[PDB]
């Protein structure tokens, strides 16, 4: 019964592929040829935030677009002030291998997760100012790769457990488990409406989950290697992925396939972090060749380069007004660009 | 007024930067070690003896030097990704069960994972301390001769023991052959790529061997020394 059910699976997959080709009546390379290019984007390093002791693996902006959190392999979760380049809190973590960190959109909490298979929640808006553990969200059987704070005491955590999860912090138990990925789930990105989120895994596939229902609303294939970063389009009807394939792909939730491929023949390095500009026309991408590329989201052209990192660029982040770009890297330096 | 609040930010940042210096003095003093291995490779006993005799996390201290060993446990078997976390790691401790059978070529599986570690472009400067574990069960296995490596490695029969052999008392030539033959199967990968950046330090250990904490400490000193000697291009 297995071979016949595999045959059923392959013919239904072929049906989905033919329905995608039937939806493929044109491309962006043909419709956007009449779309003017963005020119040469020559962005320069505005501020240099130094102080981390190891590779900076994660970074996330506060809702004020002023404060960042940066997580580094040394065991630190530092809160920065980008306007006053000042450290507000230096949160030591129980597990040095912190692979992710999040700043709550309410500003109240900050998360961090890694190889301990635990997402640790620290309370920023505490009565004494001492950022202390609120919860330790255990339950994943794999390393915690990316956690994004949902608004109402919920947190969307992605693990190497091949399973995402939506945790209720007040209780400490996950209310939903998002399953279907066969590889290590590497990165998350909450949609602007924070009702759907997207997951990248080492199966080169991305899954659009309904956090309210718990189903994979959509599975996007097309990348060729491990999805290292994912980020939503500003309108929440598309998302961009970066992988070790050394290419960025732009999937559309409606077109149900790739829109553009952001690759260059002289680029052989994996893409570790992805972000967007306010218009979504500029695609911020961190690379292994130690520099970030600002791709033309409508032409797959390298509109610019954010170079100046002495090692692999691990985390990107755009200010809530889009006024700056923070780039943490394995060189332990978080640089602000504009 | 905003000057006063900005000066309060400066004072809190000053305290925090003092604390971060005080914490970096501890960070760059402890050595990070990634401990890899196959299924029931005997590495758990090595953890226990390195723990008590002075994922899971182990902080020990030998000769006043701090080491942190990170036994990746409760993790999947797809070591592709979290191993990128281990570049600042001074040494990737590779444990091979030399007598894993008496299941299915665990030695060739370790050879291929070892090759994939060296050719990994992020581990192209992280050295690998290689623990060929279970050298005692391989002793009785090959001297018994009922379960051979020749059926798994025909060039073992065509392999002659090197002149650098130092057999322990009781190590018959039939065992010091397989002992040094496997070691050169790994050195065939350790020398055919990435010279001068990273180095393999193969060792022969067992559950009863206790100075494994000094063999790793001596070769992590060797790793740091070679990293400095290549910072000045003296090596």
């Amino acid at each position: 019964e297995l071979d016949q059910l595999r045959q059923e699976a392959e013919q239904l997959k072929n049906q989905i592929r033919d329905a995608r080709k039937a939806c493929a009546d044109a491309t962006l390379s043909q419709i956007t040829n009449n779309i003017d290019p963005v020119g040469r984007i020559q962005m320069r390093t505005r501020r240099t935030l130094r102080g981390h002791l190891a590779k900076i693996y994660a970074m996330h902006w506060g809702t004020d677009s002023r404060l960042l959190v940066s997580a580094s392999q040394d065991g630190k979760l530092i809160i920065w002030d980008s306007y006053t380049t000042n450290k507000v809190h230096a949160i030591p973590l129980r597990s040095s291998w912190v692979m992710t960190c999040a700043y709550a959109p309410s500003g109240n909490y900050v998360a961090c997760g890694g190889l301990d298979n635990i997402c640790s929640i620290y309370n920023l808006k505490t009565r004494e100012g001492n950022v202390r553990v609120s919860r330790e969200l255990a339950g994943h059987t794999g390393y915690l790769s990316c956690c994004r704070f949902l608004d109402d005491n919920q947190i969307v955590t992605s693990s190497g457990d091949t399973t995402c999860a939506l945790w209720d912090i007040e209780t400490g138990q996950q209310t939903t488990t998002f399953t279907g990925h066969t590889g290590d789930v590497m990165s998350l990105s909450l949609a602007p409406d924070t009702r759907l989120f997207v997951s990248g895994a080492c199966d080169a596939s991305a899954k659009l989950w309904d956090v309210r229902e718990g189903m994979c609303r959509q599975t996007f294939t097309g990348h060729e290697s491990d999805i290292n970063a994912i980020c939503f389009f500003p309108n929440g009807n598309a998302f961009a992925t970066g992988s070790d394939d050394a290419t960025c792909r732009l999937f559309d939730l409606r077109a149900d396939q790739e829109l553009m491929t952001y690759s260059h023949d002289n680029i052989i390095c994996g893409i570790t972090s992805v972000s967007f500009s306010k218009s979504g026309r500029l695609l911020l991408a961190g690379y292994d060749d130690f520099n970030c590329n600002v791709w033309d989201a409508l032409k797959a052209d390298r509109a610019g380069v954010l170079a100046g990192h002495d090692n692999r660029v691990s985390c990107l982040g755009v200010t809530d007004d889009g006024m700056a770009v923070a780039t943490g890297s394995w060189d332990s330096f978080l640089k602000i660009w504009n | 007024d905003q000057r006063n609040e900005e000066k309060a930010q400066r004072e809190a940042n000053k305290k925090i930067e003092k604390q971060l210096q005080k914490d970096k003095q501890v960070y760059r003093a402890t050595h990070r070690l990634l401990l890899l291995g196959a299924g029931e490779s005997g590495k758990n006993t090595i953890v226990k003896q390195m723990r008590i005799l002075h994922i899971f996390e182990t902080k020990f201290q030998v000769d006043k030097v701090n080491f942190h060993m990170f036994d990746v446990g409760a993790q999947r078997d797809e070591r592709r990704k979290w191993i990128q976390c281990f570049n600042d790691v001074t040494a990737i401790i590779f444990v091979v069960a030399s007598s894993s059978y008496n299941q299915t070529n665990r030695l060739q599986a370790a050879l291929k994972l070892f090759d994939s570690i060296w050719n990994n472009k992020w581990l192209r400067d992280t050295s690998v301390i290689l623990f060929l574990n279970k050298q005692d069960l391989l002793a009785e296995k090959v001297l018994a001769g009922k379960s051979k490596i020749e059926d798994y490695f025909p060039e073992f029969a065509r392999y002659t023991t090197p002149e650098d052999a130092t057999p322990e008392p009781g190590e018959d030539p039939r065992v010091t052959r397989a002992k040094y033959f496997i070691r050169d199967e790994f050195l065939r990968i350790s020398t055919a790529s990435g010279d001068g950046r990273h180095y393999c330090y193969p060792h022969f250990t067992c559950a009863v061997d206790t100075e494994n904490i000094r063999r790793v400490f001596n070769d992590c000193r060797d790793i740091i020394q070679r990293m400095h000697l290549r910072q000045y291009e003296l090596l």
Partner: nanobody
Framework: QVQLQESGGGLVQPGGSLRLSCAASGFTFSNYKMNWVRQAPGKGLEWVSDISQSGASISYTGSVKGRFTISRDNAKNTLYLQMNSLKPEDTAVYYC?????????????????????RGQGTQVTV
């Protein structure tokens, strides 16, 4: 879609010869290192033989050296394994696998229990 379909297996008498064809589709074959792994009955996934993108560096498992031979057609996206002078231990489901990253000599986790870019396997009974 990383697609790895395989053909050419089946039943053969001990001592025969077989050639397994790995028709890859969905990823540019010349970009990434390819190899064969096999899962004999007895719960063991073992790597068999490497071949680089260009086909210059070829290794073999000891138990299959001199008797197994691999080729690659980067144009047709196919990998072959001619299995000459078979032994009763050679009964196994052979998976045609490629390591995750292109332009890398490193080959991680092709032999993992639930690897993603590993073929569907063909059973070769001796």
């Amino acid at each position: 879609q990383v697609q790895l379909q395989e053909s050419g297996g089946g039943l053969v008498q001990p001592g025969g010869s077989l050639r397994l064809s790995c028709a890859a589709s969905g990823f540019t074959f010349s970009n990434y290192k390819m190899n064969w792994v096999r899962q004999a009955p007895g719960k063991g996934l073992e790597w068999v033989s490497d071949i680089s993108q260009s086909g210059a560096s070829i290794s073999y498992t000891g138990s299959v050296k001199g008797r197994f031979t691999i080729s690659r057609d980067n144009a047709k996206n196919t990998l072959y394994l001619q299995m000459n002078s078979l032994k009763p231990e050679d009964t196994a489901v052979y998976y045609c696998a490629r390591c995750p990253a292109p332009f890398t000599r490193d080959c991680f986790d092709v032999t993992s229990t639930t690897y993603a870019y590993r073929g569907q396997g063909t059973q070769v009974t001796v």
